[PDB]
Structure 1
Amino acid sequence: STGSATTTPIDSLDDAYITPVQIGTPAQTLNLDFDTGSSDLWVFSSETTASEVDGQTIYTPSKSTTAKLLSGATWSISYGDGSSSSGDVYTDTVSVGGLTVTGQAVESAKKVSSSFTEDSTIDGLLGLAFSTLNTVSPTQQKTFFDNAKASLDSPVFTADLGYHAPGTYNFGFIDTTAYTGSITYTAVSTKQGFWEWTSTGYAVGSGTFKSTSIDGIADTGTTLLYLPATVVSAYWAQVSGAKSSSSVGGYVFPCSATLPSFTFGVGSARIVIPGDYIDFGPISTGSSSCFGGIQSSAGIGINIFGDVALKAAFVVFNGATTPTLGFASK
């Protein structure tokens, strides 16, 4: 089997992407944030604290004939940005772009932090990291991808994120028309539960390529590109007036700038992020100071190839016995 779903930016900055997901019988369609950096599928629901819901579409398990309470199971998760959610667990039928899993753990939020409440366009998350990170207790649950794998034509999913435009998540097949040139595959470590790999270096604008190993994760659930302070300083030094601002929380630059591109290595291949992708607009409405899309990972504890990097590529998440990552230009 296969699945194919369109994923859409939630706003004009591509702060995140939502993909329609059918849950239960009859289908309840919720727009979820597909997150290759976590492994819980959780949703706003009929059980969510009423004051913490503001515009989201909710899953109501009592209206689904295939929903079953997973007796005794709870979940609680915290993300790298400090947001969080928690609740109990149902199993139900979950379909993505024509691909159906029965008995999927659907984690029902009783509590969500303010940033989720304030995000009216995101009805939940669908984790696509490795199932070892799943927070369900006392019995850990599998991701949608892990549940689907055996039925898939090929044990893969692909992320094809758009820049200010819709894109595509495919399950079980590689759309050879969706990218240019070849796909370069690179090794993955699952030791921390992430799609963790090692980039072979970088370049800034038309600069020469610096060969250097950069360990990081492919994370569709993170907006920006977080890299070592040395790399990030080298990038922003090429933008007149750019500076790191503690008060804002990162590198800012004059909105009048033209940003250079940023290239990262995948083995011998190169992915080029256009400078435009790195502009996240005014720090506050009306400001002439703009927020940078490449930021320091120092104090995160890990480098993150978030959407800024991934949307510049066609990305293959290969979940074979030995997982790997593939990157192609597009």
Structure 2
Amino acid sequence: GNTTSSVILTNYMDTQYYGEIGIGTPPQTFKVVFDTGSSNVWVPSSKCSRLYTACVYHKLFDASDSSSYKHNGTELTLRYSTGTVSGFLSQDIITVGGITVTQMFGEVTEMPALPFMLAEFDGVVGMGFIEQAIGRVTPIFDNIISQGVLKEDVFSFYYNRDSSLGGQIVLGGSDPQHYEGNFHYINLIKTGVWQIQMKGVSVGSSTLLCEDGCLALVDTGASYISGSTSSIEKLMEALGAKKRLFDYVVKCNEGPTLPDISFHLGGKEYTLTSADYVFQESYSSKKLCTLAIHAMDIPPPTGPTWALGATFIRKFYTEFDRRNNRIGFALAR
């Protein structure tokens, strides 16, 4: 059909990128992460007991103030890699930058403080495929596409390096003010998942890893690059990084020395120098700069998989293509 719209997103410290949807008539503004790993939409419920302190610190959806809410009620539990939330389903109209769509979503009734006491976004909007939607709630993008409004059945991510605009999603296309050189499309390995095949991680000069072909979720709703705790440990052993429990660290003076590491995603040799993966908070002899790669064991479901999160999407503009079932990366301007 023809139209494109775009969601500007705010960037919080290169670790949280969230935009804004409005649910209801009148609209109730919510901050959300637009994440390609999940496929359901949820937001905190006014009904959340505020004995969950993530609920007494976030926007809550009040359906009694919405004229257009159509009550449904089926329980829902989203078990994400990092934490879980449960609640029930509701339906109201959600507005995703310009396009308005009736949508089934979750009003979360239970929301752990860890980690959601530290999340600057209030909800999640999944850009995944229906194969992952808990409870087969038709996901907002298959809904927008039914409007017939978009030019192209695609969406693209720009995640800025921060301090200017924080990032941008374009629904319906991709915006060449933000990428240079031209695209490199890798096809999806099955439909249902923004998943692709990866065959080789190389620390410095020589393939230490995934030499026999691994997978990679390309995950916009993840701050880091991650591999399973084995693949990560040998990468980290090699770099010389230590574990301060949730992350690996390095003595900051070494940071600007750490080898370029490269991802050989189907076709090309996508490659991050040590600016790209190290948070250079300083350049001291001793103090510790965290690295932007985490171990994360994504569960059997999809797989154990490497998740290419926001450390990678900020170096290469990601176009997610549903019409031809493939992902394409090209360089960020």
Q: Same fold (TM over 0.5)?
A: yes
Cα 1:232–1:318 change in 2 (3 A) is farther
The one-letter code sitting in structure 2 at the alignment partner of 1:251 is: Y
Do the aligned residues in 2 keep the contact of 1:253 with 1:291 (CA within 8 Å)? Answer: yes
Kept in 2, the 8 Å contact 1:272–1:312? The answer is no
Map 1:86-235 onto structure 2 (within 5 A). Answer: 86-101=86-101, 103-119=102-118, 121-136=120-135, 140-150=136-146, 151=148, 152-164=150-162, 166-190=166-190, 193-204=192-203, 207=205, 212=211, 213-227=213-227, 229-230=230-231, 233-234=234-235
Among 4, 7, 17, the alignment partner of 1:5 is 7
- Would the alpha carbon gap of residues 146 and 190 (structure 1) be closer, same or farther in structure 2, given more than 3 Å must change? farther
The RMSD of aligned alpha carbons is 2.5
SS at match of 2:234: helix
Equivalent residue number for residue 64 of structure 2 = 62
Contact 1:278-1:292 at 8 Å conserved across structures: yes
Question: What residue is the counterpart of 1:294 in the other structure?
Answer: 293
Counterpart for residue 45 of structure 1: 45
Aligned residues: 311
Q: What does 1:218-257 correspond to in 2, within 5 Å?
A: 218-227=218-227, 229-230=230-231, 233-234=234-235, 237-238=238-239, 242-245=240-243, 248-257=245-254
In structure 1, the partner of 2:255 is 258
Distance 1:173 1:202, change over 3 A: same
Task: Provide TM-score, normalisation by structure 1.
Answer: 0.85
User: Relative to structure 2, which stretch is displaced further, 296-305 or 47-56?
Assistant: 296-305
Shift in alpha-carbon separation, 1:22–1:69, aligned structure 2, 3 A = same
The amino acid that maps onto 1:155 is D
Q: Is the 8 A contact 1:68 1:91 kept in 2?
A: yes
- Report the counterpart of residue 315 of structure 2 in structure 1: 312
- For each residue in 1:271-293, what CA deviation from the matched residue of structure 2 results, as whole angstroms up to 9, or x when unmatched? 333423323478xxxx9233221
Unaligned runs of 5+ in 2: none
Match of 1:272 in 2: 271
Query: How many Å separate the matches in 1 of 2:84 and 2:248?
Result: 26
C-alpha displacement of 1:202 = 3.9
Q: Distance in 2 between matches of 1:110 and 1:249?
A: 27
Identity %: 23
Residues 236-276 of structure 1 deviation map (CA, whole Å, 9 limit, x = unaligned): 624xxx3343x614432112322443332333333333423
> Which amino acid in structure 1 is aligned with residue 107 of structure 2?
S
Instruction: Tell me which amino acid in the other structure corresponds to 2:144.
Output: A
Alpha-carbon contact 1:39-1:131 (below 8 Å) kept = yes
